[PDB]
Design a binder for this molecule. Structure first.
Ligand SMILES: O=P(O)(O)OC[C@H]1O[C@H](OP(=O)(O)OP(=O)(O)O)[C@H](O)[C@@H]1O
Ligand SMILES: O=P(O)(O)OC[C@H]1O[C@H](OP(=O)(O)OP(=O)(O)O)[C@H](O)[C@@H]1O
Ligand SMILES: CSc1cccc(C)c1Nc1cc(C)ccc1C(=O)O
Ligand SMILES: CSc1cccc(C)c1Nc1cc(C)ccc1C(=O)O
Ligand SMILES: [Mg+2]
Ligand SMILES: [Mg+2]
Ligand SMILES: [Mg+2]
Ligand SMILES: [Mg+2]
Lengths: 341, 341
């Protein structure tokens, strides 16, 4: 195998042979790839139209190189709540707020996260601002999960060999297939999740990767462009269960949610988004809460997939009570306290 | 303009706006583009399918940055004989031998040329092996042209600012839109040429660039994959004249040429290819001679373009006579002697 062989095949608009995508990604992760080669591969893989098999090979190499958590430290029903980012809408941190609520409802959460790429404050940035430690290693994340009910895996910390690739990506700016890999490479390997995809035409491929792993996942894309379940309009959901994918459209109005305007979900810097978290967890009613409760419920539905309508109802009930009882506010405080010890 | 904008447009499989290819190439030539960006552009432009407008902009930037020849030193009817290479056959240097014959027939030839990419020898390398000085500045190429009847512009010598692009070309290996630019960027700007193209789907694009310039050119592709008029099988000729492009098929056997086997046109190292030049110019008959006579005749038809079958007949006569009189052998000896001075 070689770069001229693989790049040539891609520029011929042909799918790769089995193992070729993995070879390429392994060359990239081990530092044996030139930036020009990394870039050529990223762009070519994107314009050919990647397959689930191919993207799965990429994610697989990353996970084969990632720092794992210790054995028997991640509950079999742990869930992730994370998105690709890149929706260019710059919102409050919906996945992170949902994650907290979900944990507070008693679903174990091992969250994969990262700083912002284009937004003002990403999940990792806002958690930082809240006083939550984002620098924890495998053992401490494992302890966080057991002691608090939530663990945060900071992507750069668990995927050190990915730096070469990430660098090239910033240099070229355009989204590529690599923009899918974040959600697909949680190092704790949870089997369930609510997974945001900003790219409507690649979400199905992402779902395909999760199906192959037999995860219970909702891959979500808001029809307004959000890599979240949105409240401003309908969302597209690729529901992954029993190794199968099926495309659905979801309308929150069916569950009594009023439509919101995108500006109502708008975020700011880390201090502002941190304030927004506290407000929701503090019981503030409004569009931000509604969006949080919806995405939380979605994660719980994914967890249950390990009955659609009853599952959503139960999820909305549980997510709302987790906030109203103070359990979610208390969990964030305990999470902060955990790191300070 | 910006890289995320331009690259985003290409990955969305859209043609660029007027001026965007030029901005990109200008960033590349002025050392303002990172290797990753260069590569991403080359690959993205290739897989979108470049237009004649876009490739003409690339070539135009290169020519706007090139060392020119002194004013009033390039005959208005000068011709080029050159191809893309990248045919992966390692043949004898047909364009270079053809170029000598054409000059010997009294048609001024300013040849754009370069060392080999994958071939064992290459045009510029074979000339060196023959004692010809390839690394001459603008002033001396002009003198060579006036005194000998032929001039060689060494692409690296006249296009220094292309160095960044050439490096990335090497690293990624795969042919890209950049592989079209050599024949399109002769710094002497001849208005006629026999132009070889190894990429059948891109030959029409090259033809359109010459058409926009109102050049008189035959863009040629051997149906055996040769970036020359072949003697193995038929050939596809995009004829360019009066700003219009007419595609047509060409069979050498219609002029008495026996079909040869590509083994017979095979090449070797510089010393080997240099020997083959001396052999053809010395009167040796066989498949190599025939191919040289055919391509030389093609260049002469292109020159005439500044009647199809009659032009080819006169072209074939003039080519054969230029060898048979010894004029081509003599012109090479004088070309060598010119360099030793
Ligand atoms: O800058 P962007 O490209 O727009 O990405 C915004 C954030 O969204 C993603 O994470 P995540 O879903 O976990 O964070 P969230 O809570 O804000 O939704 C990503 O890792 C970023 O942190
Ligand atoms: O290494 P390759 O990619 O296979 O290309 C072989 C040669 O052909 C091209 O020029 P040119 O047509 O002028 O040289 P020629 O005499 O061999 O035809 C190219 O510049 C190379 O020198
Ligand atoms: C230096 S960024 C990085 C570092 C290590 C691993 C990964 C996977 C990423 N990238 C992401 C991680 C997540 C969790 C979300 C998005 C991305 C991305 O860059 O698209
Ligand atoms: C470092 S190679 C180079 C250097 C300067 C200018 C050019 C245009 C090229 N490239 C070519 C020039 C010719 C004449 C033929 C082919 C190529 C090519 O790169 O494929
Ligand atoms: Mg998110
Ligand atoms: Mg988001
Ligand atoms: Mg040639
Ligand atoms: Mg050739």
């Amino acid at each position: 195998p070689s770069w001229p062989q693989i790049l040539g095949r891609l520029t011929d608009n042909r799918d790769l042979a089995r193992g070729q995508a993995a070879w390429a990604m392994d060359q990239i992760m081990t530092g044996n790839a030139r930036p020009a080669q990394i870039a050529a591969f990223a762009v070519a893989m994107t314009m050919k139209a990647p397959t689930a098999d191919e993207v799965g090979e990429l994610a697989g190499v990353m996970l084969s190189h990632a720092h794992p958590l210790p054995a028997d430290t991640v509950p079999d029903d742990a869930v992730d709540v994370v998105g690709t980012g890149g929706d260019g809408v710059n919102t409050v941190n919906l996945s992170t707020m949902a994650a907290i609520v979900v944990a507070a409802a008693g679903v174990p959460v091992v969250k994969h996260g990262n700083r912002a790429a284009s937004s003002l404050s990403g999940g990792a940035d806002t958690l930082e601002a809240l006083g939550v430690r984002i620098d924890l290693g495998p053992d401490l994340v494992a302890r966080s999960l057991a002691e608090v009910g939530i663990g945060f895996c900071f992507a750069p910390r668990f995927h050190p060999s990915y730096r070469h690739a990430a660098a090239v990506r910033r240099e070229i700016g355009v989204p590529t297939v690599f923009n899918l890999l974040g959600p697909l490479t949680n190092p704790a390997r949870p089997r369930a999740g609510l997974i945001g995809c900003a790219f409507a035409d690649l979400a199905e491929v992402m779902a395909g990767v999760f199906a192959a792993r037999r995860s219970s996942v909702l891959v979500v894309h808001g029809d307004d462009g959000l890599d979240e379940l949105t409240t401003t309009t309908t969302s597209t959901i690729w529901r992954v269960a029993a190794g199968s994918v099926d495309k659905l459209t979801f309308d929150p109005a069916g569950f009594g949610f009023a439509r919101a305007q995108l500006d109502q979900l708008a975020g700011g810097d880390a201090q502002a988004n941190a304030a927004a978290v506290r407000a929701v967890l503090g019981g503030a009613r409004g569009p931000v809460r509604d969006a949080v409760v919806l995405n939380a419920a979605g994660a719980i539905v994914a967890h249950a997939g390990l009955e659609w309508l009853p599952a959503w109802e139960e999820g909305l009930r549980r997510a709302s009570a987790a906030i109203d009882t103070g359990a979610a506010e208390q969990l964030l405080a305990r999470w902060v306290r955990f790191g300070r010890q």
